[PDB]
Amino acid sequence: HHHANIDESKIKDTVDDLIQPLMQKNNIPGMSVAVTVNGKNYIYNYGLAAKQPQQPVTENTLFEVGSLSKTFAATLASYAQVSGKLSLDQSVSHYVPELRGSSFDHVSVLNVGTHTSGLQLFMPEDIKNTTQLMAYLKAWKPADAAGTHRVFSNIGTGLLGMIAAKSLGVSYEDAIEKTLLPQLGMHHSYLKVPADQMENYAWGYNKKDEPVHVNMEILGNEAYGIKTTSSDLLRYVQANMGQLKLANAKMQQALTATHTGYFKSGEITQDLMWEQLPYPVSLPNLLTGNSVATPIVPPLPPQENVWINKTGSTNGFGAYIAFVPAKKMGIVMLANKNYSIDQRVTVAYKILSSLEGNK
């Protein structure tokens, strides 16, 4: 029931007023929106996780988050780094000996963690096993030197997560599901959804409105494997702002260190997978932010006065996270349809702007 002067009702009015038109105009079947502010958490669910048979979005609904998954690979690499198992400045071939003598002699772990290796976006479809993957990587050359350009890459994120996990002595799937997500308290987050949670796994709806789930291929866990709830992602946002007891002291340091600013591209600062802009942000630069890479050396330390964000999509889903550490506020928006990023950022901006007076 609605209550004037009560936090959850005031926030719900703002969120409803933006999310309901957004879902109608984009034919989005279902969404969950989670907001944190002043140490308190608010979860709002809309519409349907599945159309036939109809299933509503609930607090337990799992959505694919696509490239939001890359921030977990970055957090894992950061955890390995602060634990003394990984140096980001070292070469990929230092950690992957089969690539010694290849172009990866000249690509750093930082490069694959910042989209500056030059590797292309998509893994070639005919690469099915590790032998084929290694043959490909051993024979690969970019047109420009590593460290000169930003090119978003699923392959690079794959290497980042693989190297991080190996430096901890485990597979990536083990590192994520047995170490990272449990230490973060994210008990409803998965690379592979278990049988008791399949009833909660929303269907995605593609551009043709067909129900789809993402097909996991080689190194896909690192780049697009996470299925999760808005509540678990809100915990992840809070952890990224140091708000939770948590994990480890090492885990808090790992999360914070992913916000280190390593390269500038246009107006955007590239962190370890996360991207950030100075806060306050005007909506135009947010939209303009969605290339030559200039190093930030020494790296920009993790900041409070920034808007940190990441989009992610699969064929059937569209996700977004943004948070402002200086304001201890953040938002997670999950949808089971891939709708345009300009709308994700605009709605998030309007919601977060609503959470305090102008001054």
Q: Toward ligand MER, which CB reaches closer, 183 or 263? A: 263
The minimum distance between CB 114 and ligand MER, in angstroms, equals 11
The minimum distance between CB 67 and ligand MER, in angstroms, equals 3
Q: Rounded CA gap, 276 and 289, in Å? A: 10
Site string for ligand MER, 270-289 (x = CB under 6 A): -----x--------------
Contact between 313 and ligand MER per CB under 6 A: yes
The minimum distance between CB 236 and ligand MER, in angstroms, equals 15
Query: What's the distance, CA 299 to chain centroid?
Result: 21
Which residue from 113, 302, 312, 325 is in contact with ligand MER, where contact means CB under 6 A?
Answer: 312
Contact between 311 and ligand MER per CB under 6 A: yes
C-beta of residue 173 within 8 angstroms of C-beta of residue 88? no
Contact between 228 and ligand MER per CB under 6 A: no
Which residue from 102, 309, 315, 336 is in contact with ligand MER, where contact means CB under 6 A?
Answer: 309
Distances (CA, A) of 1 to 4, 30, 314: 10, 21, 35
The minimum distance between CB 245 and ligand MER, in angstroms, equals 29
C-beta of residue 49 within 8 angstroms of C-beta of residue 64? no
Contact between 290 and ligand MER per CB under 6 A: yes
Contact between 47 and ligand MER per CB under 6 A: no
Per the listing, tokens 């808090």 go with 252
Q: Rounded CA gap, 64 and 32, in Å? A: 12
Residue number with the smallest Cβ distance to ligand MER: 67
Annotation says 102 is catalytic? no
- Per CB under 6 A, which of residues 61..90 are in contact with ligand MER? 66-67, 70
Which residue from 223, 226, 237, 254 is in contact with ligand MER, where contact means CB under 6 A?
Answer: 223
Q: Rounded CA gap, 212 and 85, in Å? A: 38
E strand or H helix at 265: strand 261-265
Q: Which one-letter DSSP state was computed for residue 149?
A: B
Distances (CA, A) of 238 to 172, 245, 332: 24, 10, 11
Q: Rounded CA gap, 117 and 42, in Å? A: 39
Q: Toward ligand MER, which CB reaches closer, 168 or 202? A: 202
The minimum distance between CB 6 and ligand MER, in angstroms, equals 32
- Per CB under 6 A, which of residues 338..357 are in contact with ligand MER? 341
Contact between 204 and ligand MER per CB under 6 A: no
Contact between 12 and ligand MER per CB under 6 A: no
Q: Toward ligand MER, which CB reaches closer, 177 or 275? A: 275
Q: Please name the residue ranges forming H helices in the chain.
A: 7-26, 69-82, 92-95, 109-113, 130-138, 154-167, 172-174, 181-183, 220-224, 230-240, 249-257, 283-288, 341-353
Q: Rounded CA gap, 37 and 27, in Å? A: 29
The minimum distance between CB 348 and ligand MER, in angstroms, equals 10
Q: What's the alpha-carbon Rg for the chain, to the nearest Å?
A: 20
Q: Which of 67, 91, 153, 231 is catalytic?
A: 67
Q: Which residues bind ligand MER (CB under 6 A)?
A: 66-67, 70, 152, 154, 223-224, 275, 290, 309-313, 341
| Catalytic residue numbers, as ranges | 67
